[PDB]
Amino acid sequence: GEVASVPLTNYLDSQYFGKIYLGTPPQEFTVLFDTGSSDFWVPSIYCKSNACKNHQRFDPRKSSTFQNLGKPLSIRYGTGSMQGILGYDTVTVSDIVDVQQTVGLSTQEPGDVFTYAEFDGILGMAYPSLASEYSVPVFDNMMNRHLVAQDVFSVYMDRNGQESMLTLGAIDPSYYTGSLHWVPVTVQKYWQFTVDSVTINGMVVACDGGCQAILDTGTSLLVGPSSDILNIQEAIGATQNRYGEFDIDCDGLSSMPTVVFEINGKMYPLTPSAYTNQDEDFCTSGFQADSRSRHWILGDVFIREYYSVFDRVNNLVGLAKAI
């Protein structure tokens, strides 16, 4: 068993992606390491979509270890989707070599979700129940073959810097202070757990009486039901603008309240600096409402403040204060 330190590139505090190598000889790809999914796929030469045209495309004909599976694959990510075929090939993640790994080769990527993204493909980190038929998640192969020292991985996202890190097989203590607090996963599909309440100035403004949340490295913002998120926006002083997002007075942070998420009895505060995104001298709320949200999505906004540990041994989520 080994441990892989995969550096993550940070693009505008909204996309964290690493690099992997597929096939023999290696073909390099940037993948989004996504805890909100469990499928591994890259673009292939057979895909003629625009997203495939402006990204790196895998050429199985040039891979001596590729083995076609002849099985279809279809996934839905955000407003977009992907269709393709499954195959077998070796994937290198840092210093871990995962031979005979199922990988999706895309044939169509309609829409623009993947067209303008910075990563080529997606490597899912959630549970096998969320993976597609005839596919095995990369981390599940790593666990079953004992390629990792511990059946655990860890995510640190650096605010504005280039020091983000995904650790496969261990927990890097350099990225947190204090003690790790463990939260039981409630449904082994996503990294789902219970949130007890959301508090601003001591009053419950969201998640009143309990709500479900998934810890998702594939989501940039902090997504929740529309009414709760609107309550939060009202309480923090954010204002709806005609461009879709919620404005925040950039100079007003020192007066804005802290939003506290209660998870398994512990408090996880988010300061105004934490839940506000700064882009081109414009300040936007990190809270995003979605008419489809049946539960909360704790995205990069939350993970940047809390070093996140995903434990498949005991099926737990560890959280600690990020550096």
Automatic annotation (TrEMBL):
Enzyme Commission number: 3.4.23.4
Active site residues of this protein: D34, D216
Alphabetized UniProt keyword annotations: Aspartyl protease, Digestion, Disulfide bond, Hydrolase, Protease, Signal
GO biological process: digestion; proteolysis
Disulfide-bonded cysteines: C47-C52, C207-C211, C250-C283
Record flagged with keyword Repeat: no
Domain Peptidase A1: residue ranges: 16-320
Molecular-function annotations in GO: aspartic-type endopeptidase activity
Transmembrane segment boundaries: none
Keyword Transmembrane: no
Recorded family membership: Belongs to the peptidase A1 family.
Protein name per the record: Chymosin
Lineage: Eukaryota, Metazoa, Chordata, Craniata, Vertebrata
Gene encoding the protein: CYM
Portion held of the full protein: 59 to 381 of 381
